[PDB]
Design a protein around this nucleic acid. Structure first.
Ligand SMILES: Nc1ncnc2c1ncn2[C@@H]1O[C@H](COP(=O)(O)OP(=O)(O)O)[C@@H](O)[C@H]1O
Ligand code: BEF
Ligand SMILES: [Mg+2]
Lengths: 617, 107, 95, 86, 93, 87, 98, 108, 93
DNA sequence: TCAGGATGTATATATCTGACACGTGCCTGGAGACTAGGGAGTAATCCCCTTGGCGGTTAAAACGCGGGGGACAGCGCGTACGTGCGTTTAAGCGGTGCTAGAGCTGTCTACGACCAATTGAGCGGCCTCGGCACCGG
DNA sequence: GGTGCCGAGGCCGCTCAATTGGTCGTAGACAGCTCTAGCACCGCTTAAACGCACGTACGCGCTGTCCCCCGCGTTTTAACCGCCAAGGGGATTACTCCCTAGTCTCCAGGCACGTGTCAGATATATACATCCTGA
């Protein structure tokens, strides 16, 4: 087991590393930050000051750590607090590099204006003509802070690496989960910065070795070298049995040793215990029935691997799960089914608009019951989806009911993104919904004005969806938050959702059970850790349960809502009785060749030739 | 037991037995499968029958009874497939197809 | 008399129907033996060896004249020039 | 008895003979400088085939050039000939 | 000595498609050359098909792939079916 | 309303007019008619499907599902277009 | 009036730079989509190695460059400097690709 | 019983032993002579040297020290003998020989 | 697995003619395929040469004649000279 | 545009001969039955690398304007090729004899395949340094 | 010019493939002899080549017109590279059996050899189809 004769080597490097347990790492302690940190406008929360304590302690002890708070607890302000503190108490100006995602760059700029106006900063972005304008200022060194994006740290390394950086800060440090990341190679080699920090809400994703890559970047060899990469786990363990997470004989101490190893430099803080006044954030998963068009398409793609087409016959798509995922979302994404139904269903061909989209996909059917109801209670709902091709289909259906929506996607102009955030967050705003992509809209954004979140489809890893949920569940939210994760009954999405659920267990062993808040030092960790084993058993499989009446119960947060919610529900029933058209597809128009379903000849005789005129007369 | 040739057993007119020997003696591989000579003799018979049909038709159109090299040339070069197979082949005493450019013809 | 060019078509129509060799045999055979002396002396030819060379050589030349004729037409001419032979051999890859 | 070295036998490829070859190729009208150009083309072509045929002949340690020698020489030039064996 | 040729087999095939039409000596010599040429085109390509795949046997599978490579388009389809039927009738009885 | 324009690409049109001119410059031509671009797309298409058909035949013979570089090399050597530099 | 080059001198500018280079002159992605589409006709569910597609593009440009070299002589032979589609058909027919 | 490679006793830098193996494995004939690999390896070594020095000369003429496919292309296509040997061959990343027709370039 | 090539032998020849120049990786694979091409071109002709004369062995004489048939002109004269020199040296030693 | 005359093309009939097609003996190569072995079919496992999707920059592509270089039609000239007649040369033929060289048969022996031990050359993997690009001028 | 760094040159450990050594038997070499096909001759018709000259059709150079192609600029688009994810196949390995080479024994299809005779020129006599000229 030799767990002991591994930490001792760690104790060496902190000693040697410091020269140029927890206590030897934290040699210098300075409890002075409680004073009024000046050049500010707002006031820090009580715990944020404690976070600043942990931050300046790393500065004194010459350490690099991870501000792995939860995904709404003012991580931008805490970093700004450190910058202002160093400029005053340590009196060092420094250049203070900061790396942020593109959509967050406007937010970071705004925070400096209202929290530290005296700090002079350059927002390094724009076309190459704009970016060479900053070069004279950079060489003079008059700036104090520089904000860039992951892209410009690679594109403009030849002029950014020249500056010696008194402190490097990287926001949303998920980008470094890959060790062979091009950003890591450029950052550690070309860029010199003694004092590096990471901000993240999900310190480790699906795999355990990814967290090592973050630590290896922060502390290259002093943490532990890459060449000598001997591990506590020594092997990845991931099987249906969750109570075992390593090749050991049901041993809990091995996990408890990791918590001790990375305790000195990591600061997790939970939303529940740190900030209890936020509302509950209840989460719901609601299934969806498959339309007749989807059911026939999903069957053949899963069985034969082919998409059904017209006689103009089948096409063989390539990534089977990806195609099945698209079918479950909307069968018009393939643009071959849409065009054929553009003609046959009766109206103009090509681009298709109407109640067919209402009826084509089970997920859209359920939205049109939900969205008008949410319009009544004046709730603003922000909606995430994975594929951009789905948004365009989603965008047309939103015009048919005339909803007022904004769409912040990838491939939207960087200049426009800041405005879109402003208009939606405006008080008295007229916009009802705000289309987002998971990858571009899921990162640091303050969409606090929305109270409910619809997750149209789930990602392969769950932490991507957890970022999406917490775009509204942040500091500054006063309304109850409800997350409505759509799903499809008896489809691959359950396998995706269940596989994601399995990845949620590895971090809960390592990060969640650690409780790196410096207050829970007591033995509650083992009380927490052993409580993880028994709740695995109590799960029971659930299928084929749309729960037609329960859905409005799931939206509603008060009884007076039901009084509103029980009006339009019956009105749709009475209105639909006049013209009896199935709410779903329900085999109505499947007479298309899809459901209709389910040169080369012989030798020496068949060869068809043309008469030849050998006569020549 | 009565001896029955492999050509008759495969229903061919070409010598399956001889084709087998030519493959072994030709240094094409260390081993020759049992079905390889049969398959190859059938393909050779097909191509022979395909060209002789067209040549026989060319002989008939010229009111002749015997095939001559001219008729083989007419059969091969008029067929689209056979012309590509025998693109780099020249046939002795075959001549050329009667073909005159349109621009050369009188106005 | 006949207008110039009408006998040429009559010759074209005639020779494209026949198949015999278009070169006298003795002049060709003497040419073959002259070339062979440069390589080895006191050689000796089978009768079919010379006939094989003649069949190959006249098929080469007739096929070349078909190619040089298209180059002549391509330049809007009906007379084939030496420059037309050279272009045909260039495209084929003999130059 | 004494072999006489043949000379200037290319001129045996007469002007009418070249015209007949041109007619079979569909040529309607021939320039005057074609004839010397053709004699050069025939000579170059015909030396290449003789060179290989003699190479095949001397390798077999023979003193006569057979039809197989010519057919094998032609097949390397990329131009197979049917009707002489092989 | 004796010289081998496909003369009698070509003549047998001729009488199945044109029972009245005959063949001249020079034409048979061309047909004999045609069969020999095509045989070596198939066998040579099948030879290096086995070499590319590190096999040491040429089978009816190697012959069929060689036919598909050499014969042009629709002509290859009939040759493949002709060969498969022969090997099928040969194996069964 | 932009979904219709993406499918009307006809990826043979991916061989753009400037790309064809770049090939023509390396071939040394100075002035190009406007009908070359359509003509040279057909010439490339015919050339590719001859080589692709032979490369796939080699692949299918070997029980593989992936066209390797040797399949392309072997196909080109069969058309007399030997290529050096891909093993 | 802005400075404008005479016609032809910019087209001839390739001599100094753009005929001594050796990179591929067709974009990678459009070519690769074309290769896969052609292969759909012969076999479905086919995969290509990355180096397999490069070999096809390497041979394709060498073919098209070599064809334009022959097209250019068929144009000059007809006393003009503009290549036309009738020049490609003449060049290919002489090579025997018709 | 001391081992001396057949390449050394023939004064070659090419593997006579390996070439002898390739002949026996390639189904070229039933038997392989003893002098056939020595003769064949010598020829292959000569052809390699001819290309290598010609490519090396083109490397200096660009004031470069390494051989790249461009230099192999320039060496082969400039020499009329190697060009005829490699007429049907395409060299990847080779480029073309710089050549402009006389008519195209301006001539006052 | 172990894959054989001519890389080291080509590099030995390179340092004989240009002791200082190096060779890139792509240029090395181009040279490697060139040697394979010429090898099977000569070996293929010599094999066919021995079949024509009803021999069953490949000797240096077939290798010599194949060089004349394949290599053009002045290349063949020098290649024959090198091959003859190597065989006499090998036989004497 | 139609009529006439001249030349040439296409037509029906004897007849004739040399090659196609048939029959015969026979020898050698193919078919039938056996045995011994190893090539390859088959199963199972590992993990490389292929495929589809999004994100965000920016260079290339696209669209349009505008001018002039070049393609094409037309016309006039004059040279060189085609047509035909008459003269000259040498090919095609049918013999004939000479003999040289290819083919065949029989011995004989040296060389190359086969096998079995043995070790070092050649390959994969690794450090390390510099040739070459590149960012500016 | 200078700085940078990715690709190449160089070093080491580990096999497996080349070398050495014998043994065998068969392919290849040699001599002798046969006979046939190629080389050379002759004389002869006579068809093909040569030569001369006339006119005429065509190559060719010039000119003028016009419109298509080039070049430039502005905006737009998608290739490119960076990144996410999952799993289909491309390799290996091990086992084992069945197919193929190899042998001997028949034995009959196919080859060379003669033989008979008929299909396809070749030559005669003839009414129509094509041009060249006139109108
Ligand atoms: N002391 C404070 N006063 C006002 N607002 C705060 C304070 N601390 C945090 N916030 C709010 O919390 C939100 C999150 O800030 P940020 O540093 O981005 O944390 P995260 O990265 O977890 O979202 C911001 O919208 C900010 O307005
Ligand atoms: F944690 Be916040 F979403 F930056
Ligand atoms: Mg943040």
């Amino acid at each position: 087991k030799l767990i002991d004769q591994k930490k001792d080597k760690r104790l060496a490097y902190l000693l040697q590393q410091t020269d140029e347990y927890y206590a030897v790492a934290h040699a210098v302690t300075e409890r002075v930050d409680k004073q009024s940190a000046l050049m500010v406008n707002g006031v820090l929360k009580q715990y944020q000051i404690k976070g600043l304590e942990w931050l300046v302690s790393l500065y004194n002890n010459n350490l690099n750590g991870i501000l792995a708070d939860e995904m709404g607890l003012g991580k931008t302000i805490q970093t700004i607090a450190l910058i202002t503190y160093l400029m005053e108490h340590k009196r060092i100006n420094g250049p203070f590099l900061i790396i942020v995602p593109l959509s967050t760059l406007s937010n970071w700029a705004y925070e400096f204006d209202k929290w530290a106006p005296s700090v002079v900063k350059v927002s390094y972005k724009g076309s190459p003509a704009a970016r060479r304008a900053f070069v004279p200022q950079l060489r003079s060194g008059k700036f104090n802070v520089l904000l860039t994006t992951y892209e410009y740290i690679i594109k403009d390394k030849h002029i950014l690496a020249k500056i010696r950086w008194k402190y490097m800060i990287v926001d949303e440090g998920h980008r470094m989960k890959n060790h062979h990341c091009k950003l890591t190679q450029v950052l550690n080699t070309h860029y010199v910065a003694p004092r590096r920090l990471l901000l993240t809400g999900t310190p480790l994703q699906n795999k355990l070795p990814e967290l090592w890559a973050l630590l290896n970047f922060l502390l290259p060899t002093i943490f532990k070298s890459c060449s000598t990469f001997e591990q506590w786990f020594n092997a990845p363990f991931a099987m249906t049995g969750e109570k075992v997470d390593l090749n050991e004989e049901e041993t809990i101490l091995i996990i408890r040793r990791l918590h001790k190893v990375l305790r000195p430099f990591l600061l997790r803080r939970l939303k529940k215990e740190v900030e209890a006044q936020l509302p509950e954030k209840v989460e719901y998963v609601i299934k969806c029935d498959m339309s007749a068009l989807q059911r026939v398409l999903y069957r053949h793609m899963q069985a034969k691997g082919v998409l059904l087409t017209d006689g103009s016959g089948t096409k063989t798509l390539m990534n089977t799960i990806m195609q099945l995922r698209k079918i479950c979302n909307h069968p018009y994404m393939f643009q071959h089914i849409e065009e054929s139904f553009s003609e046959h269903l009766g109206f103009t061909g090509g681009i298709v608009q109407g109640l067919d989209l209402y009826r084509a996909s089970g997920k859209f059917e359920l939205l049109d019951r939900i969205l008008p109801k949410l319009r009544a209670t004046n709730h603003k709902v922000l909606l995430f989806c994975q594929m951009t091709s789905l948004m365009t289909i989603m965008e047309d259906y939103f015009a048919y009911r005339g909803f007022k929506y904004l769409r912040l996607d990838g491939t939207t102009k960087a200049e426009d993104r800041g405005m879109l955030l402003k208009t939606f967050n405006e008080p008295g705003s007229e916009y009802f919904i705000f289309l987002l992509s998971t990858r571009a809209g899921g990162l640091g954004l303050n969409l606090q004005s929305a109270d409910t979140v619809i997750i149209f489809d789930s990602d392969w890893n769950p932490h991507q969806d957890l970022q999406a949920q917490d775009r509204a569940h942040r500091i500054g939210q006063q309304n109850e938050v409800r997350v409505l994760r759509l799903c499809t009954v008896n489809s691959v999405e359950e396998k995706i959702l269940a596989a994601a659920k399995y990845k949620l267990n590895v971090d809960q062993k390592v990060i969640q059970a650690g409780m790196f808040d410096q207050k829970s030092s007591s033995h509650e960790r083992r009380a927490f850790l052993q409580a993880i084993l028994e709740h695995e058993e109590q799960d029971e499989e659930e299928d084929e349960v749309p729960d037609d009446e329960t859905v409005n119960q799931m939206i509603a947060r008060h009884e007076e809502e039901f009084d509103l919610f029980m009006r339009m529900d019956l009105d749709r029933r009475r209105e639909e009785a006049r013209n009896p058209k199935r709410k779903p597809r329900l085999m109505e128009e499947d007479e298309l060749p899809s459901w209709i379903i389910k040169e080369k000849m012989f030798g020496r005789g068949s060869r068809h030739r043309k008469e030849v005129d050998y006569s020549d007369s | 037991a009565k001896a029955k040739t492999r050509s008759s057993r495969a229903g061919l007119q070409f010598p399956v037995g001889r084709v087998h020997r030519l493959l072994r003696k030709g240094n094409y591989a260390e081993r020759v499968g049992a079905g390889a000579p049969v398959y190859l003799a059938a393909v050779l018979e097909y191509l022979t029958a395909e060209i002789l049909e067209l040549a026989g038709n060319a002989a008939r159109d010229n009111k002749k009874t015997r095939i001559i090299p001219r008729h083989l040339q007419l059969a091969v070069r008029n067929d689209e497939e056979l012309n590509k197979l025998l693109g780099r082949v020249t046939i002795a005493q075959g001549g050329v197809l009667p073909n005159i450019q349109s621009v050369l013809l009188p106005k | 008399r006949y207008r110039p060019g009408t006998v040429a078509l009559r010759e074209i129509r005639r020779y494209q129907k026949s198949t015999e060799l278009l070169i006298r045999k003795l002049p060709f055979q003497r040419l073959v033996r002259e070339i062979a002396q440069d390589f080895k002396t006191d050689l000796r030819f089978q009768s079919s060896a010379v006939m094989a060379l003649q069949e190959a050589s006249e098929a080469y030349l007739v096929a070349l004249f078909e190619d040089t004729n298209l180059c002549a037409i391509h330049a809007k001419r009906v007379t084939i020039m030496p420059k037309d032979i050279q272009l045909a051999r260039r495209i084929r890859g003999e130059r | 008895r004494h072999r006489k070295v043949l000379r200037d036998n290319i001129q045996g490829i007469t002007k009418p003979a070249i015209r007949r070859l041109a007619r079979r190729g569909g040529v309607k009208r021939i320039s005057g400088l074609i004839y010397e150009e053709t004699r050069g083309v025939l000579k170059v072509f015909l030396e290449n085939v003789i060179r290989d045929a003699v190479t095949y002949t001397e390798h077999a340690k023979r003193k006569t050039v057979t039809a197989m020698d010519v057919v094998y020489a032609l097949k390397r030039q990329g131009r197979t000939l049917y009707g002489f064996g092989g | 000595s004796r010289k081998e040729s496909y003369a009698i087999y070509v003549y047998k095939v001729l009488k199945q498609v044109h029972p009245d039409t005959g063949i001249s000596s020079k034409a048979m010599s061309i047909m004999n050359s045609f069969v020999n040429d095509v045989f070596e085109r198939i066998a040579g390509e099948a030879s290096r098909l086995a070499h590319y795949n590190k096999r040491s046997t040429i089978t009816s599978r190697e012959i069929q792939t060689a036919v598909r490579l050499l014969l042009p388009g629709e002509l290859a389809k009939h040759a493949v079916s002709e060969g498969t039927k022969a090997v099928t009738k040969y194996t069964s009885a």
